[PDB]
Short mmCIF file of C-alpha atoms and ligand atoms in Angstrom, two decimals:
data_model
loop_
_atom_site.label_atom_id
_atom_site.label_comp_id
_atom_site.label_asym_id
_atom_site.label_seq_id
_atom_site.Cartn_x
_atom_site.Cartn_y
_atom_site.Cartn_z
CA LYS A 36 0.00 0.00 0.00
CA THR A 37 3.08 2.20 0.30
CA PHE A 38 3.96 1.60 -3.36
CA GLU A 39 0.58 3.01 -4.39
CA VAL A 40 1.22 6.60 -3.30
CA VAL A 41 4.39 7.11 -5.39
CA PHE A 42 2.96 5.68 -8.61
CA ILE A 43 0.35 8.44 -8.68
CA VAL A 44 2.92 11.25 -8.35
CA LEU A 45 4.87 9.52 -11.10
CA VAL A 46 1.92 9.27 -13.48
CA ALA A 47 0.37 12.69 -12.78
CA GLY A 48 3.78 14.32 -12.45
CA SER A 49 5.10 12.88 -15.70
CA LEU A 50 1.83 13.77 -17.42
CA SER A 51 2.18 17.37 -16.25
CA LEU A 52 5.80 17.27 -17.41
CA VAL A 53 4.86 15.98 -20.85
CA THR A 54 2.13 18.63 -21.00
CA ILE A 55 4.41 21.61 -20.41
CA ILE A 56 7.19 20.20 -22.60
CA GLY A 57 4.71 19.70 -25.44
CA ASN A 58 3.21 23.18 -25.32
CA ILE A 59 6.67 24.72 -24.93
CA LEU A 60 7.65 22.90 -28.11
CA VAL A 61 4.57 24.41 -29.74
CA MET A 62 5.43 28.00 -28.73
CA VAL A 63 9.11 27.50 -29.61
CA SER A 64 8.44 25.82 -32.96
CA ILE A 65 6.11 28.68 -33.89
CA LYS A 66 8.55 31.46 -32.96
CA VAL A 67 11.47 29.64 -34.63
CA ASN A 68 9.79 28.50 -37.86
CA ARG A 69 8.66 31.49 -39.91
CA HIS A 70 6.64 29.38 -42.36
CA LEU A 71 4.08 28.18 -39.78
CA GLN A 72 3.70 31.74 -38.47
CA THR A 73 0.29 32.22 -40.07
CA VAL A 74 -2.65 33.98 -38.41
CA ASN A 75 -4.23 30.58 -37.70
CA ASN A 76 -1.22 29.67 -35.56
CA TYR A 77 -1.46 32.74 -33.33
CA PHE A 78 -4.56 31.13 -31.89
CA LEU A 79 -2.42 28.02 -31.46
CA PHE A 80 0.12 30.18 -29.64
CA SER A 81 -2.44 31.57 -27.20
CA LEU A 82 -3.81 28.06 -26.79
CA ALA A 83 -0.38 26.58 -26.04
CA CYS A 84 0.19 29.41 -23.55
CA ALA A 85 -3.00 28.65 -21.61
CA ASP A 86 -2.17 24.94 -21.77
CA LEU A 87 1.31 25.77 -20.48
CA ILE A 88 0.07 27.67 -17.42
CA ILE A 89 -2.42 24.84 -16.90
CA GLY A 90 0.35 22.31 -17.42
CA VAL A 91 2.78 23.71 -14.87
CA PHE A 92 0.56 25.24 -12.18
CA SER A 93 -2.89 23.64 -12.12
CA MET A 94 -1.66 20.09 -12.68
CA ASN A 95 1.05 20.11 -10.01
CA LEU A 96 -0.97 21.91 -7.34
CA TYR A 97 -3.84 19.47 -7.87
CA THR A 98 -1.28 16.65 -7.79
CA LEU A 99 -0.21 17.96 -4.39
CA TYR A 100 -3.82 18.43 -3.20
CA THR A 101 -4.68 14.84 -4.11
CA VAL A 102 -1.47 13.17 -2.93
CA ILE A 103 -1.40 14.84 0.50
CA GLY A 104 -5.04 14.21 1.35
CA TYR A 105 -5.87 17.87 1.86
CA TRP A 106 -5.00 21.42 0.81
CA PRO A 107 -2.28 22.58 3.24
CA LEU A 108 -1.34 25.84 1.53
CA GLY A 109 -4.05 28.05 3.08
CA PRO A 110 -7.21 29.95 1.99
CA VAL A 111 -5.28 32.68 0.16
CA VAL A 112 -3.50 30.47 -2.37
CA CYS A 113 -6.52 28.17 -2.50
CA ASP A 114 -8.69 31.03 -3.74
CA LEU A 115 -5.77 32.10 -5.92
CA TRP A 116 -5.00 28.69 -7.46
CA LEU A 117 -8.67 28.03 -8.15
CA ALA A 118 -9.23 31.46 -9.71
CA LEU A 119 -6.14 31.03 -11.90
CA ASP A 120 -6.96 27.45 -12.95
CA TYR A 121 -10.61 28.15 -13.77
CA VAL A 122 -9.75 31.35 -15.65
CA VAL A 123 -7.00 29.87 -17.83
CA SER A 124 -8.98 26.66 -18.49
CA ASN A 125 -11.94 28.76 -19.58
CA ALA A 126 -9.36 30.64 -21.65
CA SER A 127 -8.31 27.36 -23.28
CA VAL A 128 -11.92 26.58 -24.14
CA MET A 129 -12.63 30.06 -25.53
CA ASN A 130 -9.44 29.66 -27.56
CA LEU A 131 -10.65 26.40 -29.09
CA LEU A 132 -13.98 28.10 -29.75
CA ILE A 133 -12.41 31.08 -31.50
CA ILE A 134 -10.27 28.64 -33.51
CA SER A 135 -13.48 26.91 -34.54
CA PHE A 136 -14.99 30.21 -35.68
CA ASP A 137 -11.82 31.11 -37.56
CA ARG A 138 -11.74 27.79 -39.41
CA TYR A 139 -15.43 28.14 -40.27
CA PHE A 140 -14.87 31.54 -41.85
CA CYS A 141 -11.73 30.28 -43.61
CA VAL A 142 -13.86 27.55 -45.15
CA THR A 143 -17.07 29.41 -46.08
CA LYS A 144 -15.26 32.53 -47.29
CA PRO A 145 -12.41 30.76 -49.12
CA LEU A 146 -10.62 33.74 -50.69
CA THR A 147 -12.02 36.87 -49.04
CA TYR A 148 -11.70 36.17 -45.31
CA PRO A 149 -8.09 34.89 -45.22
CA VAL A 150 -6.94 38.16 -46.80
CA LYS A 151 -9.37 40.44 -44.92
CA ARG A 152 -8.45 38.89 -41.56
CA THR A 153 -5.33 40.56 -40.15
CA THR A 154 -3.00 39.83 -37.22
CA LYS A 155 -4.56 42.67 -35.22
CA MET A 156 -7.90 40.85 -35.40
CA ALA A 157 -6.25 37.67 -34.08
CA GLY A 158 -4.71 39.49 -31.12
CA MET A 159 -8.11 41.09 -30.51
CA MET A 160 -9.99 37.78 -30.41
CA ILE A 161 -7.32 36.22 -28.19
CA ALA A 162 -7.50 39.12 -25.74
CA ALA A 163 -11.30 38.87 -25.91
CA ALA A 164 -11.12 35.18 -24.99
CA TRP A 165 -8.84 35.72 -21.98
CA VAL A 166 -10.76 38.77 -20.79
CA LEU A 167 -14.16 37.05 -21.03
CA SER A 168 -12.85 33.95 -19.26
CA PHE A 169 -11.40 36.08 -16.47
CA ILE A 170 -14.56 38.17 -16.04
CA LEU A 171 -16.79 35.10 -15.99
CA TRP A 172 -14.75 33.18 -13.43
CA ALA A 173 -12.34 35.25 -11.31
CA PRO A 174 -14.58 37.84 -9.58
CA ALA A 175 -17.20 35.21 -8.72
CA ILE A 176 -14.55 32.89 -7.28
CA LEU A 177 -12.65 35.12 -4.85
CA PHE A 178 -15.39 37.51 -3.69
CA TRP A 179 -17.99 34.78 -3.11
CA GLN A 180 -16.97 34.75 0.54
CA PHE A 181 -17.00 38.52 0.96
CA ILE A 182 -20.57 38.68 -0.34
CA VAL A 183 -21.86 35.67 1.61
CA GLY A 184 -19.96 36.77 4.72
CA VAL A 185 -18.50 33.34 5.49
CA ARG A 186 -15.89 31.13 3.82
CA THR A 187 -17.93 27.96 3.22
CA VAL A 188 -14.75 26.15 2.15
CA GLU A 189 -13.58 23.51 4.63
CA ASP A 190 -10.20 23.98 6.34
CA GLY A 191 -8.63 20.88 4.80
CA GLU A 192 -10.21 20.89 1.33
CA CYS A 193 -10.02 23.55 -1.39
CA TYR A 194 -13.02 23.87 -3.72
CA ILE A 195 -15.11 26.63 -5.28
CA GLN A 196 -17.71 27.60 -2.70
CA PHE A 197 -20.28 28.68 -5.27
CA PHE A 198 -20.76 24.95 -5.97
CA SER A 199 -23.10 24.78 -2.98
CA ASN A 200 -25.29 27.31 -4.80
CA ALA A 201 -26.65 25.62 -7.94
CA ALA A 202 -28.12 28.81 -9.43
CA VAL A 203 -24.71 30.31 -10.27
CA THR A 204 -22.96 26.97 -10.87
CA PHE A 205 -25.20 26.11 -13.82
CA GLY A 206 -25.00 29.54 -15.43
CA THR A 207 -21.22 29.66 -15.20
CA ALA A 208 -20.71 26.05 -16.29
CA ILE A 209 -22.85 26.37 -19.43
CA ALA A 210 -21.16 29.57 -20.60
CA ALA A 211 -17.88 27.71 -20.18
CA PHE A 212 -18.62 24.32 -21.69
CA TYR A 213 -22.21 23.58 -22.74
CA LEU A 214 -22.83 26.74 -24.75
CA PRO A 215 -19.29 26.71 -26.24
CA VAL A 216 -19.41 22.99 -27.09
CA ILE A 217 -22.79 23.54 -28.77
CA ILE A 218 -21.34 26.40 -30.82
CA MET A 219 -18.12 24.57 -31.74
CA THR A 220 -19.94 21.39 -32.74
CA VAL A 221 -22.60 23.21 -34.78
CA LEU A 222 -20.23 25.41 -36.81
CA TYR A 223 -17.87 22.46 -37.27
CA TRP A 224 -20.93 20.69 -38.66
CA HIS A 225 -21.34 23.65 -41.00
CA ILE A 226 -17.67 23.25 -41.95
CA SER A 227 -17.88 19.53 -42.72
CA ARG A 228 -21.20 19.71 -44.57
CA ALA A 229 -20.48 22.86 -46.60
CA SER A 230 -16.83 22.29 -47.50
CA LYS A 231 -16.57 18.91 -49.11
CA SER A 232 -19.85 17.98 -50.83
CA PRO A 254 -19.18 7.47 -50.39
CA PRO A 255 -17.08 10.68 -50.57
CA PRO A 256 -13.42 9.84 -51.38
CA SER A 257 -11.10 12.27 -49.56
CA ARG A 258 -12.60 15.66 -48.77
CA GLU A 259 -15.55 14.63 -46.60
CA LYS A 260 -13.56 11.62 -45.36
CA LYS A 261 -10.52 13.49 -44.03
CA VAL A 262 -12.55 16.51 -42.91
CA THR A 263 -15.05 14.38 -40.97
CA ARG A 264 -12.14 12.40 -39.51
CA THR A 265 -10.15 15.37 -38.19
CA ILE A 266 -13.25 17.26 -37.01
CA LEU A 267 -14.36 14.10 -35.23
CA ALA A 268 -10.99 13.75 -33.48
CA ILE A 269 -11.07 17.38 -32.30
CA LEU A 270 -14.65 17.24 -31.01
CA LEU A 271 -14.04 13.85 -29.38
CA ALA A 272 -11.02 15.24 -27.55
CA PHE A 273 -12.82 18.34 -26.26
CA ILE A 274 -15.81 16.28 -25.13
CA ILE A 275 -14.04 13.24 -23.62
CA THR A 276 -11.92 15.64 -21.56
CA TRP A 277 -14.19 18.54 -20.58
CA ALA A 278 -17.57 16.79 -20.31
CA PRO A 279 -17.11 14.34 -17.38
CA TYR A 280 -16.27 17.12 -14.87
CA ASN A 281 -18.85 19.50 -16.35
CA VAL A 282 -21.57 16.90 -15.88
CA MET A 283 -20.29 15.88 -12.43
CA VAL A 284 -20.33 19.53 -11.38
CA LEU A 285 -24.04 19.36 -12.22
CA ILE A 286 -24.46 16.06 -10.35
CA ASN A 287 -22.89 17.35 -7.13
CA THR A 288 -24.93 20.56 -7.19
CA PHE A 289 -28.05 18.61 -6.21
CA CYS A 290 -26.51 16.20 -3.69
CA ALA A 291 -23.34 16.54 -1.62
CA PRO A 292 -22.51 12.88 -0.84
CA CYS A 293 -23.39 11.76 -4.38
CA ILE A 294 -19.90 11.68 -5.90
CA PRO A 295 -16.84 9.77 -4.59
CA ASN A 296 -13.67 11.86 -4.29
CA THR A 297 -11.80 9.40 -6.52
CA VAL A 298 -14.21 9.83 -9.42
CA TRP A 299 -14.19 13.59 -8.81
CA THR A 300 -10.39 13.65 -8.96
CA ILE A 301 -10.53 11.74 -12.25
CA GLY A 302 -12.97 14.31 -13.65
CA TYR A 303 -10.53 17.07 -12.72
CA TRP A 304 -7.57 15.27 -14.31
CA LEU A 305 -9.57 14.43 -17.43
CA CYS A 306 -10.15 18.16 -17.69
CA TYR A 307 -6.42 18.76 -17.33
CA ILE A 308 -5.33 16.33 -20.06
CA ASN A 309 -7.13 18.37 -22.73
CA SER A 310 -4.36 20.92 -22.25
CA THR A 311 -1.99 18.02 -22.81
CA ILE A 312 -3.62 16.77 -26.00
CA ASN A 313 -4.12 20.17 -27.65
CA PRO A 314 -0.74 20.11 -29.48
CA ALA A 315 -1.91 16.84 -31.08
CA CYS A 316 -5.30 17.94 -32.39
CA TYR A 317 -4.26 21.34 -33.67
CA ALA A 318 -0.49 21.50 -34.16
CA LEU A 319 0.88 18.00 -34.82
CA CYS A 320 -2.27 17.11 -36.77
CA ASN A 321 -0.63 19.35 -39.36
CA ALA A 322 2.20 17.65 -41.25
CA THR A 323 4.94 20.28 -40.87
CA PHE A 324 4.60 20.99 -37.14
CA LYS A 325 5.84 17.54 -36.10
CA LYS A 326 8.85 17.80 -38.42
CA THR A 327 9.64 21.15 -36.79
CA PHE A 328 9.21 19.49 -33.38
CA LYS A 329 11.66 16.62 -33.86
CA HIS A 330 14.76 18.83 -34.23
CA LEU A 331 14.35 19.99 -30.63
CA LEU A 332 15.25 16.44 -29.61
CA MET A 333 18.67 16.42 -31.28
CA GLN B 5 9.04 20.98 -48.62
CA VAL B 6 7.11 22.82 -51.33
CA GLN B 7 7.81 26.00 -53.33
CA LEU B 8 5.65 27.04 -56.30
CA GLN B 9 6.78 28.52 -59.65
CA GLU B 10 4.60 30.43 -62.15
CA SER B 11 4.48 30.89 -65.94
CA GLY B 12 2.53 32.46 -68.80
CA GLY B 13 3.39 35.99 -67.71
CA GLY B 14 3.33 38.27 -70.74
CA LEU B 15 1.71 41.20 -72.53
CA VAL B 16 -1.74 40.95 -74.10
CA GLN B 17 -4.22 43.31 -75.79
CA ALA B 18 -7.77 43.69 -74.50
CA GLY B 19 -9.89 40.72 -75.54
CA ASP B 20 -6.98 38.30 -75.68
CA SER B 21 -6.31 35.36 -73.36
CA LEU B 22 -3.50 33.85 -71.27
CA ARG B 23 -2.58 30.63 -69.49
CA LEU B 24 -0.81 30.99 -66.15
CA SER B 25 0.64 27.70 -64.93
CA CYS B 26 1.77 26.99 -61.39
CA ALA B 27 4.12 24.08 -60.68
CA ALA B 28 4.58 22.73 -57.15
CA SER B 29 7.45 20.48 -56.07
CA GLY B 30 9.29 18.90 -53.16
CA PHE B 31 6.81 16.53 -51.50
CA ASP B 32 7.74 14.21 -48.65
CA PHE B 33 5.17 12.47 -46.42
CA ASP B 34 2.76 15.04 -47.81
CA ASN B 35 0.89 14.86 -51.12
CA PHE B 36 0.05 17.47 -53.76
CA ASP B 37 -3.38 15.90 -53.31
CA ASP B 38 -3.38 17.27 -49.75
CA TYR B 39 -3.00 20.87 -50.93
CA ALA B 40 -5.73 23.15 -52.25
CA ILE B 41 -4.29 25.75 -54.62
CA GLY B 42 -5.37 29.28 -55.54
CA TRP B 43 -4.35 32.26 -57.67
CA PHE B 44 -3.87 35.70 -56.10
CA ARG B 45 -3.34 38.88 -58.12
CA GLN B 46 -1.74 42.05 -56.75
CA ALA B 47 -2.21 45.44 -58.38
CA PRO B 48 0.11 48.35 -57.46
CA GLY B 49 -0.60 49.17 -53.81
CA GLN B 50 -3.96 47.39 -53.85
CA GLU B 51 -5.20 44.51 -51.67
CA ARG B 52 -3.82 41.05 -52.43
CA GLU B 53 -7.19 39.81 -53.71
CA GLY B 54 -7.85 36.17 -54.59
CA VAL B 55 -8.98 35.41 -58.13
CA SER B 56 -9.81 31.71 -58.08
CA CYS B 57 -9.18 28.53 -56.13
CA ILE B 58 -9.22 24.82 -56.84
CA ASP B 59 -9.09 21.58 -54.87
CA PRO B 60 -7.39 18.86 -56.95
CA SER B 61 -8.45 16.01 -54.64
CA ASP B 62 -12.16 16.69 -55.13
CA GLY B 63 -11.96 18.71 -58.34
CA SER B 64 -14.10 21.36 -56.65
CA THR B 65 -13.94 24.77 -58.34
CA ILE B 66 -14.42 27.98 -56.34
CA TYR B 67 -14.18 31.34 -58.13
CA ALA B 68 -14.38 34.97 -56.99
CA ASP B 69 -17.33 37.22 -57.82
CA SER B 70 -15.08 39.41 -59.97
CA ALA B 71 -13.57 36.76 -62.26
CA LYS B 72 -16.55 34.44 -62.81
CA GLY B 73 -17.28 33.62 -66.45
CA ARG B 74 -13.88 34.47 -67.90
CA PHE B 75 -11.47 32.43 -65.79
CA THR B 76 -11.16 28.63 -65.84
CA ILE B 77 -8.99 26.49 -63.55
CA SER B 78 -7.89 22.84 -63.52
CA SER B 79 -4.79 20.70 -62.94
CA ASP B 80 -2.78 17.54 -63.56
CA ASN B 81 -3.01 15.41 -60.39
CA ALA B 82 -0.23 13.05 -61.48
CA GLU B 83 2.11 15.87 -62.53
CA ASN B 84 1.35 17.99 -59.45
CA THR B 85 0.92 21.14 -61.58
CA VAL B 86 -2.12 23.44 -61.85
CA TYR B 87 -3.37 25.43 -64.84
CA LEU B 88 -5.35 28.68 -64.78
CA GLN B 89 -6.50 29.97 -68.17
CA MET B 90 -8.10 33.41 -68.32
CA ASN B 91 -10.09 34.60 -71.35
CA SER B 92 -11.28 38.02 -72.60
CA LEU B 93 -8.97 40.12 -70.40
CA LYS B 94 -9.32 43.82 -69.59
CA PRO B 95 -6.54 46.27 -68.63
CA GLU B 96 -7.98 46.01 -65.10
CA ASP B 97 -6.23 42.66 -64.60
CA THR B 98 -2.73 44.15 -64.63
CA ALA B 99 -1.13 42.60 -61.56
CA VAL B 100 1.43 40.14 -60.23
CA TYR B 101 -0.08 36.65 -60.10
CA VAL B 102 1.15 34.49 -57.22
CA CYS B 103 0.32 30.90 -56.37
CA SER B 104 -0.97 29.84 -52.95
CA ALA B 105 -1.38 26.44 -51.31
CA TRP B 106 -3.34 25.92 -48.09
CA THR B 107 -3.68 22.57 -46.38
CA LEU B 108 -6.88 21.80 -44.47
CA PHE B 109 -7.52 24.57 -41.94
CA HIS B 110 -4.66 26.68 -43.34
CA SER B 111 -1.96 25.05 -41.20
CA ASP B 112 0.59 24.55 -43.98
CA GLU B 113 0.33 27.79 -45.97
CA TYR B 114 2.54 28.48 -48.98
CA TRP B 115 2.98 31.32 -51.45
CA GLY B 116 5.00 31.51 -54.65
CA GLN B 117 6.98 34.37 -56.19
CA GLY B 118 4.58 35.36 -58.96
CA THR B 119 4.48 36.37 -62.63
CA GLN B 120 3.58 39.72 -64.22
CA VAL B 121 0.51 39.93 -66.45
CA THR B 122 0.21 43.33 -68.13
CA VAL B 123 -2.80 43.91 -70.39
CA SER B 124 -2.55 46.50 -73.16
CA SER B 125 -5.15 48.98 -74.46
C1 LIG C 401 -12.07 21.79 -14.74
N1 LIG C 401 -11.05 22.54 -13.90
C2 LIG C 401 -11.63 22.88 -12.63
C3 LIG C 401 -9.86 21.73 -13.67
C4 LIG C 401 -10.66 23.72 -14.62
C5 LIG C 401 -11.74 24.63 -15.10
C6 LIG C 401 -12.63 25.45 -15.51
C7 LIG C 401 -13.76 26.45 -15.88
O1 LIG C 401 -14.15 26.51 -17.27
C8 LIG C 401 -14.39 25.36 -17.97
N2 LIG C 401 -14.75 24.13 -17.39
O2 LIG C 401 -14.91 23.23 -18.40
C9 LIG C 401 -14.92 23.95 -19.63
C10 LIG C 401 -14.32 25.24 -19.36
#
């Protein structure tokens, strides 16, 4: 039973490690290679940044939280870590969303949009993503104890204390996952159906890649987002193990992003391999 | 990797026709089939507007609202070289014609160097 507790820090730790290394390779390979420095890859840059913060901070602090048995760092950095994590994860999702939009417009408007869209617009949509994420999550997270008048959070554990109140939990969760997944999936549907007219290559490859992307986003972000809804009705409903796995499943999206967006392109991987030796 | 060279750049009087040809090369683990190719013209100081675009894999033709009816595009899938023939030109088509190749979702984006097409009268 003593072997058990090290294996988890090895798996989660090495997964975090792989995460940050991967996204660092994304950022590096974009700044180094001038050919892949297209407007579409700026969104990949912002994405890899969010996934980097997530990779190094969220993953390791949650690794600590889980491996110790409690949150020993205090209310200040609990509120902090949670605010940060939720904000930058929402930022990741909004990034994916804005990527979806961009790809839709690149498909429907095949010649006009790619020229009309400038770098300034990309920076604007990125900033919009981060700002909206921050506004939607941060103020509600920290000041939920100043408004209620009591920190509902237990001394040992560290969770968002608006979870007890379903009314806000739903509204925040849907604007973070449900609404955005609906949007992404629907305009990706528009992409697949409008782009490529059994269909030999176009519809085949498009449907394949789109499927992989959507499957990733869902398989990672859904379990927690549906468990957050489960626990909002009943407190003893969900086992802490399953909860932990929901959290981690959410984290590994930020690990798999350089595989669905970057490496799914042919050149990116070639650019990656030189960083080895 | 791929770099794209153009041809057919010359002088023509109004009403005449030209054939600009774009040749792509240098494929490894990627296929010319995996690239959708378009023609962009640039007038002096004006926006780099896109004339026409073709997908060789599907054979799907997509033209711009300005060049519809005069311009025709196709290719040679085995030779990995595309052909754009334009007919009944006006002196308003005086520009440098460059060749672009986007992979799905614009990840691998390539441009050429371009050829000059000056129309007389
Ligand atoms: C799931 N985790 C708590 C680890 C991070 C977060 C967050 C808030 O926003 C979103 N949740 O799922 C989709 C986006």
